Amino acid sequence: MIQEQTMLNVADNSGARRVMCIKVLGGSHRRYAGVGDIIKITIKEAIPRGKVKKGDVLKAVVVRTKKGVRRPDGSVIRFDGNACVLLNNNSEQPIGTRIFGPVTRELRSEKFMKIISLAPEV
Amino acid sequence: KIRTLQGRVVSDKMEKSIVVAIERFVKHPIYGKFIKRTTKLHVHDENNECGIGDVVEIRECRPLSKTKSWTLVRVVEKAV
Amino acid sequence: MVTIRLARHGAKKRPFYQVVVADSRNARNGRFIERVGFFNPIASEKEEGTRLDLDRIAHWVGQGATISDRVAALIKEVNK
Amino acid sequence: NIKSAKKRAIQSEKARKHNASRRSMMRTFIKKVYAAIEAGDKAAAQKAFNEMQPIVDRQAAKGLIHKNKAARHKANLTAQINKLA
RNA sequence: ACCCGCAGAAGAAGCACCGGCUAACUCCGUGCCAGCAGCCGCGGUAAUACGGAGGGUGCAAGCGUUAAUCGGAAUUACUGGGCGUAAAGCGCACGCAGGCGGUUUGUUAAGUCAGAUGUGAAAUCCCCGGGCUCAACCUGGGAACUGCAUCUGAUACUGGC
RNA sequence: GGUAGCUAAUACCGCAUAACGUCGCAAGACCAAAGAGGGGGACCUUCGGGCCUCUUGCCAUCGGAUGUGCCCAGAUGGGAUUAGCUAGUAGGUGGGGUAACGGCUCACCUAGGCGACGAUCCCUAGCUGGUCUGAGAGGAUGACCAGCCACACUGGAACUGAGACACGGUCCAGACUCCUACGGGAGGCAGCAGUGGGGAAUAUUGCACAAUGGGCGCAAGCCUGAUGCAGCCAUGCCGCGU
Numbered sequence: 001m002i003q004e005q006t007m008l009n010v011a012d013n014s015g016a017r018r019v020m021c022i023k024v025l026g027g028s029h030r031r032y033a034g035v036g037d038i039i040k041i042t043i044k045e046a047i048p049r050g051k052v053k054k055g056d057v058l059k060a061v062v063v064r065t066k067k068g069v070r071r072p073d074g075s076v077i078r079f080d081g082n083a084c085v086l087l088n089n090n091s092e093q094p095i096g097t098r099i100f101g102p103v104t105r106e107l108r109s110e111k112f113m114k115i116i117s118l119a120p121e122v
Numbered sequence: 123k124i125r126t127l128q129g130r131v132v133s134d135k136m137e138k139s140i141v142v143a144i145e146r147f148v149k150h151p152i153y154g155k156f157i158k159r160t161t162k163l164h165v166h167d168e169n170n171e172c173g174i175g176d177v178v179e180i181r182e183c184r185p186l187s188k189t190k191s192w193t194l195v196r197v198v199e200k201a202v
Numbered sequence: 203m204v205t206i207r208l209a210r211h212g213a214k215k216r217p218f219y220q221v222v223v224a225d226s227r228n229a230r231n232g233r234f235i236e237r238v239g240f241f242n243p244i245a246s247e248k249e250e251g252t253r254l255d256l257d258r259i260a261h262w263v264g265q266g267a268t269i270s271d272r273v274a275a276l277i278k279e280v281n282k
Numbered sequence: 283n284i285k286s287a288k289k290r291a292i293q294s295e296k297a298r299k300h301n302a303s304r305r306s307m308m309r310t311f312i313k314k315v316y317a318a319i320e321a322g323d324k325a326a327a328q329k330a331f332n333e334m335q336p337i338v339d340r341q342a343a344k345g346l347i348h349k350n351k352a353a354r355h356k357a358n359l360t361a362q363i364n365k366l367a
Numbered sequence: 368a369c370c371c372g373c374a375g376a377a378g379a380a381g382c383a384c385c386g387g388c389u390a391a392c393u394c395c396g397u398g399c400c401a402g403c404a405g406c407c408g409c410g411g412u413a414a415u416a417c418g419g420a421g422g423g424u425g426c427a428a429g430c431g432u433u434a435a436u437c438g439g440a441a442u443u444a445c446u447g448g449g450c451g452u453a454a455a456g457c458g459c460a461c462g463c464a465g466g467c468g469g470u471u472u473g474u475u476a477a478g479u480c481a482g483a484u485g486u487g488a489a490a491u492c493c494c495c496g497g498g499c500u501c502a503a504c505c506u507g508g509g510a511a512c513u514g515c516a517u518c519u520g521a522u523a524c525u526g527g528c
Numbered sequence: 529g530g531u532a533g534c535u536a537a538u539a540c541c542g543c544a545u546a547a548c549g550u551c552g553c554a555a556g557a558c559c560a561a562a563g564a565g566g567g568g569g570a571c572c573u574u575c576g577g578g579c580c581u582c583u584u585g586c587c588a589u590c591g592g593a594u595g596u597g598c599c600c601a602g603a604u605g606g607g608a609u610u611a612g613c614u615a616g617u618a619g620g621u622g623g624g625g626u627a628a629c630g631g632c633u634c635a636c637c638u639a640g641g642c643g644a645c646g647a648u649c650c651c652u653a654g655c656u657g658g659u660c661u662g663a664g665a666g667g668a669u670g671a672c673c674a675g676c677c678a679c680a681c682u683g684g685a686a687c688u689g690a691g692a693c694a695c696g697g698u699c700c701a702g703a704c705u706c707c708u709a710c711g712g713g714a715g716g717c718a719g720c721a722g723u724g725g726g727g728a729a730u731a732u733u734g735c736a737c738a739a740u741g742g743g744c745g746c747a748a749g750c751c752u753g754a755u756g757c758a759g760c761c762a763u764g765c766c767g768c769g770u
Contacts (some may be wrong), residue, residue, distance in 0.1 A: 013704095014703090117708075120712080133641090135640065137619060139618095145477070148477095153445070164641090185600075187619095188632090198528090210741080214756090226742095227595070230741090231674095232489075232675070234489090242506090242507095251497080266593080335558065353549095354627095364552080
């Protein structure tokens with residue numbers, strides 16, 4: 001499960017295999033992150049085709065978990081990687097032009113549908 | 123008749139092939155001195171009668187193999 | 203098809219035209235077998251204007267290359 | 283409008299299911315003729331080669347192997363039955 | 368296109384340069400300041416060097432400034448460089464692989480010289496016939512492109528034997 | 529645009545016939561396909577053809593004409609403070625492959641092959657007709673132009689056809705732009721033109737199937753940002769005003 005000091009691959013286009021989870025947020029004491037809810041990330045490698053800097057502090061949201069999406073019936077829909085997508089801290093919204101993720105029901109429960117819907121996978 | 127060139131054998135170390143050196147002897151285009159511009163060719167030889175120091179006469183086909191288009195006509199000096 | 207045809211030649215508002223034998227196949231005025239004449243649509247109303255090698259064309263037609271309506275009518279300008 | 287080149291891969295794969303299938307049949311026919319030389323000799327080989335002869339010409343009549351390979355196959359095997367003693 | 372008329376000096380001129388080399392130059396103001404300069408160098412009370420002014424010089428629908436290429440440039444040197452010092456000759460001995468080598472004969476023909484047949488695309492130079500005055504351009508006929516290959520002589524020199 | 533029911537061939541396959549082709553000294557066996565159109569009389573009918581006539585096609589064999597595939601030779605940017613380099617590199621044995629060649633592509637035996645005439649490796653790069661310069665030699669350089677070789681957003685495979693190693697194609701993938709109120713979907717201006725960006729900088733989303741060519745059609749005719757012409761600029765050259 002995703003938590004503080006976890007290294008992940010990123011769902012943002014031209015993002016590197018390595019970004020670091022520095023805070024799990026929620027204001028109260030928190031163990032692990034949650035799908036469709038925010039997390040604090042630092043960029044540990046930057047790709048020159050991408051739009052981010054190494055060592056920069058950013059806002060993100062969790063978009064796929066090895067724990068799967070499973071609330072309504074207990075029937076799990078599962079993925080073979082843990083990943084988040086990057087959000088702007090003032091203007092809001094996913095900062096990329098493509099997302100590498102399943103873009104499930106709880107991501108369309110956010111204000112983001114216009115920039116995630118190019119490829120629905122479930 | 124046919125066109126043939128003269129040379130000397132520089133390697134025989136290959137089962138059905140030999141290597142021959144030929145001298146085209148050409149004038150330098152600016153400074154006018156004549157230069158050998160010696161060229162080493164691989165030559166087809168199934169009869170295998172030659173060795174280091176033999177003077178030979180050769181002809182072109184047809185490409186016989188990769189980097190080989192010449193074949194042996196006659197042995198010229200038949201010395202030693 | 204080897205054809206006897208008119209080739210693109212002239213100036214802005216002043217076309218001149220040449221006639222050549224070529225397989226087509228080949229592109230515009232290039233890579234032709236031989237030239238046989240020139241048209242000049244004006245020809246300055248003179249007998250030293252417009253020329254056609256009617257005897258070499260006679261050896262290139264038969265039993266030879268094709269000649270279409272507009273090119274078979276060049277003989278009518280030299281008349282002949 | 284059209285671009286008939288967009289039809290030619292489909293027209294080739296639909297035909298491949300016979301036009302390449304017969305290449306496998308023809309590769310096999312060489313085996314049937316060499317198997318008739320061990321069945322064997324002059325009283326089996328030239329009788330069995332005459333099962334292959336018309337099929338090679340009947341394929342060449344449609345194109346595909348017409349430029350040399352069809353006549354090449356017939357000549358190659360005519361020379362192999364002529365070699366018999 | 369071309370022809371005929373209506374039209375009135377009417378609508379039409381620049382930019383650089385002038386101490387010595389270097390064409391044309393004097394006076395004002397500034398007073399080592401400001402503003403200049405291809406090199407020699409300008410400016411403190413005559414500035415022919417700045418800015419202006421009056422007169423000249425140059426080219427012209429152009430005139431001028433630059434980072435640069437060719438000329439001047441034989442100062443990159445083949446046509447056609449240089450090594451005592453001015454800048455380069457190794458402190459010295461021997462020598463493989465390279466370059467070079469007397470002379471009488473024959474022979475090979477790589478190389479040279481001679482003669483042909485193919486080819487060296489079309490534009491195009493140059494000669495020259497048309498088309499617009501000249502010409503750019505479209506061309507009609509010529510020429511050259513010393514080349515290269517394939518056949519064939521000379522048989523002298525060089526390499527080879 | 530997918531599927532199913534239905535129906536015909538100048539769409540398709542067999543059964544026939546078949547040359548100087550196949551292979552051989554040779555007799556000889558074998559492989560194929562389409563009619564159509566305009567005109568037109570006697571005889572006959574259910575008078576949307578029996579039948580005559582010319583044209584043009586269809587299937588095959590073998591030559592010319594012209595290309596396409598292949599390998600060489602002479603010509604050829606820099607670097608030696610790169611001196612050694614290499615394992616399909618270098619030779620043989622056997623298959624397969626192509627219209628055809630070769631290691632061309634494989635599997636195995638052999639260890640040679642290439643170097644101071646610079647191998648090996650690395651940087652730079654459309655080439656030549658041409659262009660400018662000066663008396664020329666020589667130098668600096670190859671826009672446009674004619675021809676030739678390569679390229680089609682970035683990349684692989686090659687297929688069709690007479691031909692592409694396919695600007696306006698296939699299977700798509702990558703980087704993407706655009707559409708979707710959200711269930712998957714179209715495409716590649718280094719064509720013709722504008723525009724965002726890059727730059728000290730290079731012209732208009734001009735007019736027209738009028739002429740010409742190519743393409744289909746037996747021909748009338750239809751298609752054509754091919755092409756043919758405008759528009760703008762001291763940017764170079766030439767004749768000429770004020």
